[PDB]
Amino acid sequence: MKFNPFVTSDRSKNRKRHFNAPSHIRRKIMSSPLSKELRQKYNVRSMPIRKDDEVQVVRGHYKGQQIGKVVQVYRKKYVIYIERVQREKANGTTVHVGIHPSKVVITRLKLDKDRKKILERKAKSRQVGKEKGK
Amino acid sequence: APSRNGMILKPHFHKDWQRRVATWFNQPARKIRRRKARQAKARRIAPRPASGPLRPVVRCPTVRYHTKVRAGRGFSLEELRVAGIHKKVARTIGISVDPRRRNKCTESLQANVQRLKEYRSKLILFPRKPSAPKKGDSSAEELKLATQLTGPVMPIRN
Amino acid sequence: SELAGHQTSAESWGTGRAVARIPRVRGGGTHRSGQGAFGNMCRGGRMFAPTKTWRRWHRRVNTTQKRYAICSALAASALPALVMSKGHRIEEVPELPLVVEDKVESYKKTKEAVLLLKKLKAWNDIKKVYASQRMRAGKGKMRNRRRIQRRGPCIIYNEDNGIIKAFRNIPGITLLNVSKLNILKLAPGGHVGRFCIWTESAFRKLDELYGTWRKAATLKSNYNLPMHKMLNTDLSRILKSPEIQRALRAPRKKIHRRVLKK
RNA sequence: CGACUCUUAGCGGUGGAUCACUCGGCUCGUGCGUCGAUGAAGAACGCAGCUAGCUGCGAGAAUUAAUGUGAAUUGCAGGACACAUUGAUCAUCGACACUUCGAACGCACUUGCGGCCCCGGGUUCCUCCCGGGGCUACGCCUGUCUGAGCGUCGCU
RNA sequence: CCCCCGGAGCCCCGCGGACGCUACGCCGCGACGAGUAGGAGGGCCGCUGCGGUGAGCCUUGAAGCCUAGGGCGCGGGCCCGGGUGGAGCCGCCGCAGGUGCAGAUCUUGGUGGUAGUAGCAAAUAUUCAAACGAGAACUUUGAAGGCCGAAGUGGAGAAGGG
RNA sequence: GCGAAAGACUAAUCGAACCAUCUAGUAGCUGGUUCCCUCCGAAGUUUCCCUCAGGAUAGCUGGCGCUCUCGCACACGCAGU
RNA sequence: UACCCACCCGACCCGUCUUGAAACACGGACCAAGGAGUCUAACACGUGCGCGAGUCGGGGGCUCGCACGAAAGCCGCCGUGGCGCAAUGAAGGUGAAGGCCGGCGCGCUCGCCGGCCGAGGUGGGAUCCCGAGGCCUCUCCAGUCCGCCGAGGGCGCACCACCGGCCCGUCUCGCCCGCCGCGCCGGGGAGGUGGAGCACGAGCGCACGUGUUAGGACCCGAAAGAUGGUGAACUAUGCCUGGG
RNA sequence: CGCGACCUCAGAUCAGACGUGGCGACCCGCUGAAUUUAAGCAUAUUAGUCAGCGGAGGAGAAGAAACUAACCAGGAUUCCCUCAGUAACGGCGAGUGAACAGGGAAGAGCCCAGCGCCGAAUCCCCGCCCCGCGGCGGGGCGCGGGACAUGUGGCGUACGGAAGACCCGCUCCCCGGCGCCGCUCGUGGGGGGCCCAAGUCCUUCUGAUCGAGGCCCAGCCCGUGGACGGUGUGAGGCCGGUAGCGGCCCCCGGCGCGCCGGGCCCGGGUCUUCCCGGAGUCGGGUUGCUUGGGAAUGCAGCCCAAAGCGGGUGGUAAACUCCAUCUAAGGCUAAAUACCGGCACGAGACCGAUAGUCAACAAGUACCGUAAGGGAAAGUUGAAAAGAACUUUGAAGAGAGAGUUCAAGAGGGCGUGAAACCGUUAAGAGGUAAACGGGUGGGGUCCGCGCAGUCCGCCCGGAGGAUUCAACCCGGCGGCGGGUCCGGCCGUGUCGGCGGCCCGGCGGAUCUUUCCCGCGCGGGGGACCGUCCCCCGACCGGCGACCGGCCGCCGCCGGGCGCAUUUCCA
């Protein structure tokens, strides 16, 4: 159960706080898990997806083991746009198809100044909770 | 149109009850709004009788009611010069001063004086400063208590 | 709302105009102009007797009534007949007024709790709850009341010393203090007899809570258990005592198909 | 079997019920209790690369600086940038800004008329004239200056 | 003697009892059952909401919908046969309703018959040829016949219109 | 208000406008009033009414009941007789 | 059983107001959807449950960020009060108790003093108890057990009818008084009558049905009335300024 | 024929302030109906309500008695319960219709004027410095202004106060800074940011799963987290989240020590001297509204208009007369208390797009009226536009193929997709309009079958064929029933223990202050009765409350029994 009044739990109110959330927040929402290799290496469960991050489809029509790189992110349609993830239209003009973060797994994070410090700070929070539970 | 045995009934709904109806779905949230005051006030005035100041034994008025007794408003004035308490001091010492009571009898005077005499004796005057002089009750009679009196100070039972 | 369909300013052009004598909306080059307003019968408009706020929503019971409602719920928390007959999956349970050590008030982790509910063979009620999880039939779905499930065993404890934390995530379990029992939760649906788990600490406190019988409650002001209307509740024993059987006219059970007249 | 018609059925529409959803209501609670001549509430007009509407904003106009945030933004373009960078975007907002009416304030509401101060050009105060900035609405309080009175006196 | 039913062998059986005994179940008798208004009772008659409960049902297809698909109740309705539909649904025990339509020149939206019906009648007026055009009585150009007929169907303005 | 005067006209409105609210105005008066089955089952009669289109009370009806009898070889009562 | 068709008999179109409707009365083209006895307060009776000369409920308190919680639990609260536990009188106020016995006062159907019993009786009164007598039982008698029948007799609730009684009001009448005090003081009798009275209790709380009102009030359904505002763009007048 | 004070009064675009509109639920003044009700009706009521109007704030008003009372008295306000739907009012009728006491929420008290005391002890505005400056303030210094003697400061205000005499005891608050130390309840104050478990494991459905079995305890993991939403179907585990004195970083809040600058000689108790109340006010007469106030409750206009052991009040006029109780004419104030407007949230036995607000969307929008004002309709493709490329017919609208799609019988007003209604295909009918009731008959579409429906079930006899038994004992296990209540444990009624009684409590206005503690009372202890526990002994219901042995019977398992038995099959 939730408890804290000063949080919602309302079929509608957080259905709403979806396709009205600003791009600020949608980052956090549009997060996908990391593959076991990284999840081991780094002590972080899931990350916000980013433009040039390498990704494996896990669910969907065209699930597979092919590591495609992300191309862009509709944070508006609120859905990502990957590499050989694509379909041929009537004219031959290939169009990519939408997939969530949530239905995808990160196989190689594209690292940075700003993204490293998150990976540190998430892994530091994880271990602080386990050291606090200890 | 009445039919065969009832009362008359002058129910008074010819005006406009409808507009000015108060329903009470505050009642329980109010209960709690209140709780938090009782609560907060006590934690704020930490060592001090939570209920409020000391208040006098007093007789109910009209003829039926005679035999009862109450917490009155405040102890009289005549009452204090007798107990040896200055009226403006009493107000700081958690002693409730009405200054508006005609004291008519020695019975209910001394009865009510004994409450002050009683109060003095079981009162720990917590001293102005920590390094303070006279009349404040000693660091033993000081350590022993942090005790708020829950419920009405020296409750008046008939 | 008090204003429901009642914000219109419609006169009613009554009689001489065919129409219908409703109050019909004024002027306009809209469509909503000569429609009808303030009829229960009409669009916009409003209902019978606007559901008002000062309906007597809540209700009332005598203390005594609702103390010996708890009695009757508790008394039938024994008697595996009634408890089972709520689908309370008590078959491998050792005994029915199921008392447990007072170590239990002090578990602080759901894994401990769960290991208790195995070792008292009481999974299979929670198990059962745990299968009965579905989407509610109706319109409640789109109102914060989508899922539903069974009730699981009630668990009772004189003092939260960490316990209520432990038995929380486990679906179906409700905790109740002994000092603060509740008829809604012991006897859900107004049916009798839920599976309960007294912890010794609590189980002692039941007679002091609300009485033995030739002794006061000594925790409620004045309260003693209800007397029975009759003691020997089984009558089948009664009906074949020799006292009774001796003093009875002999039967009449030829039966007696009616006679066709010739 | 001729055509029409009726009934029923087999299918085609028309209509938009029913059902199923639901970023909206409604009701009930809790917290706080938010205006203005430094110029409100209210209106007008304008503002996007492609924009009519809603919405957001104000000639510094689909925002301003800053701090988090931290890579998008996107209907299509177009872009900087160096994504080792206040560094895209969003939220916050605290830094600066506030077209025209309006209690609307120079006087009126035509959108015209002025007055009085300054600074450009003109002049070289020569006055306009052309340019620029500040004032100028009513009431009333404390104070100041200038007064009036065969009011009450004083000294002449 | 005149003996034991764990055995008389049983139409009587009292030693233990239906299949039948939802103890508000079932069974036999008799008797009786015109109805407006109204009452009353009975409704595993019907709608929507919740507490219980049904190891209910459900992407192996729900609600609705559709059915000259088998049935059942006296009947409210109910149950079964198929197709389509595409997401949720029901049974019992309770509780809760804004609760069941043929009517109110009832409300809203839609649709017929009428009906391919009334009708496209005020100012005498058109015709030819060519162009353009997929397509021309209806546009345009030419030619011809006509009208308004300077108190105009002529040429300019106001208010209004924008 | 306005009327050489006709109750003329006051923006399709005049024996006196239109707009919103009081506003669910009131109505002894029109109309309607939504699922089955079972049982019993009227009155249009009485007196008072500012009563005659309505009420008041008399009736008749249902429901709810109760006190008993005894059809359990072993009844008193009642009655459009 | 349903669809079409066929036949034979039957047969007026519903709703409604209505002494009487197929009406040469009114509503009603057809279909979908919406649609009219609701809530609250107050009574009243009926019923369900708790406790019972009590019983409650709030409003308050004590125990929550509620997830469930705006719940549940608990409180010399618990009774500060309502309702009931007693009425009657306009009001001052009075207030439900009688029987019997003995004794004393002349028992004067008047006054007082000691004891006994305590809600008086009659008739009906479900009815519980007693029961004379049957009525068997393989024989004659004897006899305990066991039931059935049972004339006749006793207690008799509830209720009904009656007769008695006591409180208050009022009347009548008539007696004796106590005496912190004086009787325009207080007090005591008898008979009658008025009382929504007592005469060994039934309420309280909470359900639900019905009903009756107050409530918009079953829905729909006026001509009006009031309060505030907008209009001379039409027309009526006046005026100002233009044109024919 | 001047100059000068003051008083009154002007003018200043003077120096500095400020007022005005809106919002308007709640809040305060006033004003103010009529529908309506009374079966009419005007009295009454609606109802001091709506409109009108005026006015405020985070709440508003009121408030420290000219009160209550009749007690053995209480003691500002407001609020809730209660009084109590009561006292009374009324063509005493419809209606109306309060209060006093008690309990409870909260609860705080105070200030003026005058009498006087005190070199105006005061106040305002300038100039120079010292600190302070995103609510303009302290500190100092200035013959820099000015009010104020028609009166500014302190004490003081009625509950007494002043002033004196001697009775007693003894000295810390305030404010401007300027630092610093303890982040100071949801369970680290407010706000923001940032952060913290566990499967996309097997297999299998499916277009896609989030579904179904399984997976080291309902499977694996997590579970202070299994709310919810997202995620091409129902997902604790994928993701956001959730839980969780979980973490960290800013900011903001508030409170604690130091330093400093300033301010302040502020007590307590006794005996005397005197000193006191707010005028066109109270009151009365009158009229007008109001309530319930009355032979006057409230408020008004006018008229008359006071006193000082007075005045008001002490609720049917009045005189006399006795008693109580306040003290007006000046003023402030938290708290509970109210909140259909605002911001910000949380929820629901709610409605679910002709409902729900007019408004799920370009909603107060389109449109109408000159204007006040009036004021709508309208949600849904799919999961993804993957939204028909291309050939072809067609001037073009439209088609046919094709293509996409799990599905286009989801095609841009697209989920579903009813009826009226209309579209055509098939069957059958058809002069008394159709339509209906009863009864059959023919035909169809379908539905049961039968390529015999001979329906099954016992038992038995016969003939074939096949396993191990049944009957019996013996070993074991498990029931059942019986009793000896045998032995023990259990509880009902009785008796005994007076044994718990103080090692058994709680109730009782029972009793003792012979007791103890604290101030006759309160608390505590000690005696008493009613209640509830131990010991053991006796009787009895010996009770579903067992448990042990003995028994009797049954069942299962394992042994024995090989076949005239006991099964299976045809």
Ligand SMILES: [Mg+2]
């Ligand atoms: Mg208090």
Ligand SMILES: [Mg+2]
């Ligand atoms: Mg509506």
Ligand SMILES: [Mg+2]
């Ligand atoms: Mg449904």
Ligand SMILES: [Mg+2]
């Ligand atoms: Mg529609």
Ligand SMILES: [Mg+2]
């Ligand atoms: Mg619809």
Ligand SMILES: [Mg+2]
């Ligand atoms: Mg002069």
Ligand SMILES: [Mg+2]
């Ligand atoms: Mg019948």
Ligand SMILES: [Mg+2]
């Ligand atoms: Mg409803």
Ligand SMILES: [Mg+2]
């Ligand atoms: Mg309907």
Ligand SMILES: [Mg+2]
């Ligand atoms: Mg002509």
Ligand SMILES: [Mg+2]
């Ligand atoms: Mg022209």
Ligand SMILES: [Mg+2]
């Ligand atoms: Mg005429």
Ligand SMILES: [Mg+2]
């Ligand atoms: Mg009629």
Ligand SMILES: [Mg+2]
């Ligand atoms: Mg006729």
Ligand SMILES: [Mg+2]
């Ligand atoms: Mg008619």
Ligand SMILES: [Mg+2]
């Ligand atoms: Mg009462």
